[PDB]
Design an enzyme around this catalytic site. Sequence first.
Site, PDB file in Angstrom:
ATOM      1  N   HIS A   1     -83.132  93.654  26.914  1.00 29.20           N
ATOM      2  CA  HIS A   1     -81.981  93.154  26.301  1.00 29.20           C
ATOM      3  C   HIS A   1     -81.937  94.831  25.030  1.00 29.20           C
ATOM      4  O   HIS A   1     -82.795  94.345  23.995  1.00 29.20           O
ATOM      5  CB  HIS A   1     -81.275  92.567  25.249  1.00 29.20           C
ATOM      6  CG  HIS A   1     -81.040  91.192  26.276  1.00 29.20           C
ATOM      7  ND1 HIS A   1     -79.998  91.478  27.519  1.00 29.20           N
ATOM      8  CD2 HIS A   1     -80.792  90.592  27.350  1.00 29.20           C
ATOM      9  CE1 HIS A   1     -79.713  91.241  28.653  1.00 29.20           C
ATOM     10  NE2 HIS A   1     -79.967  89.863  28.079  1.00 29.20           N
TER      11      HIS A   1
ATOM     12  N   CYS B   1     -81.338  96.205  28.643  1.00 26.35           N
ATOM     13  CA  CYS B   1     -80.576  95.917  28.569  1.00 26.35           C
ATOM     14  C   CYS B   1     -78.897  95.604  27.881  1.00 26.35           C
ATOM     15  O   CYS B   1     -78.904  95.835  26.098  1.00 26.35           O
ATOM     16  CB  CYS B   1     -80.316  94.705  29.258  1.00 26.35           C
ATOM     17  SG  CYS B   1     -80.795  94.354  31.020  1.00 26.35           S
TER      18      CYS B   1
END
Lengths: 208, 209
Positions: free
Chosen positions: A88, A130
């Site tokens: 992420h 992400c």
Amino acid sequence: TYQYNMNFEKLGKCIIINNKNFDKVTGMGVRNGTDKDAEALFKCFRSLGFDVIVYNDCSCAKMQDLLKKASEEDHTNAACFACILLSHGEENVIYGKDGVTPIKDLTAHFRGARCKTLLEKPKLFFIQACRGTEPRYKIPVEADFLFAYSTVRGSWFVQALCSILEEHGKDLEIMQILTRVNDRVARHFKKQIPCVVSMLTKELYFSQ
Amino acid sequence: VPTYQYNMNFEKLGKCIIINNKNFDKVTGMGVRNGTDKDAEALFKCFRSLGFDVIVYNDCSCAKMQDLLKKASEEDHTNAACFACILLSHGEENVIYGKDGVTPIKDLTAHFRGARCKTLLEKPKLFFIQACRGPRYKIPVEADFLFAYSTVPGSWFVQALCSILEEHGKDLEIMQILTRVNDRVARHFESKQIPCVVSMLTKELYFSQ
Ligand SMILES: *SCCNC(=O)COc1ccc(Cl)cc1Cl
Ligand SMILES: *SCCNC(=O)COc1ccc(Cl)cc1Cl
């Protein structure tokens, strides 16, 4: 000459940080398929000739230690170095297990002075960041660095990078590959595209 | 698609806009950028020689730079292969200096997006920035853009760009050209900075035919 000299014992080290599961305290979801991604990447890069080692669900200090240790290694017989981050990511920042770490902090260790052995040799950084719960960034500027940054089987970027490298990794220059990759993910499409930031000083081929 | 290089079979190569900001309002607290004319001239000669239609603007306000490029983005580019724009000015983070102030480099390039510039879709849009200093940014992410941002204070970058572009402009690909550029400004220093190339290009770019 106009190419990076690839005449060394080994191609170089390749670290894969593969953050899939995140600490509850970040409200970050399970990155399903990052495992399909990281496998693809291991096989592909090892095939190129890299000494690939994968590390999973890394904490921020794990990510920082990994990379500082790497920089501290002797790289006299290495032609180059390559780090790949799957996670992420928001702006200037990657998510570890236990929170967020700034990208530039990971690469700092590999600077001009701080890694005398890797001087005049390419440092390759592949980042697949992400979004997602459920403002600015500074790219560091140093000779012989390259970033291939992306936002989104596994990810379209990762898939394409492997397919092309598996196939032209030995005959095409790094920039041509990444371009073909850029093209490939674009085709799929709101509209997003990977980008390549190059501070390279020569052409990069993975052979000779 | 199936070829890996941009189609260059057009009536013309495309427009090349140079913005040459030498003098700035005392209020900005920026100095005269000496040697920027030598850059503007070398670049125009260079890009003219490649086959671009060069326009050179000088000492522009922020509103001029903004209006200038919007009107460029509203032209019909159907008969062109690409678009080049060169900014020579003072520049900090994600911002370039007009003569009267400071606009975001992003809003300048915004106009040439697939969404708002349909006649330059799948055609490379090339921004060469030579921003003098005298801190974080945000790069726009759209296909077929390419940025060549140099920071190093004729300019070493500009001079090198032209010299390589004149000699290899019609046989090398931009990533080759600009890689070679990085290398010389870098060589000017075993006495440090270096230009960085940001590519969202989707094919190889050759300026030839
Ligand atoms: S290539 C433009 C896209 N860039 C980003 O979204 C953020 O990129 C980076 C942030 C930090 C560092 Cl060290 C490198 C990069 Cl490419
Ligand atoms: S290539 C990383 C270093 N570049 C900079 O210093 C600033 O970069 C940019 C800022 C705005 C825009 Cl639109 C493009 C760029 Cl490359």
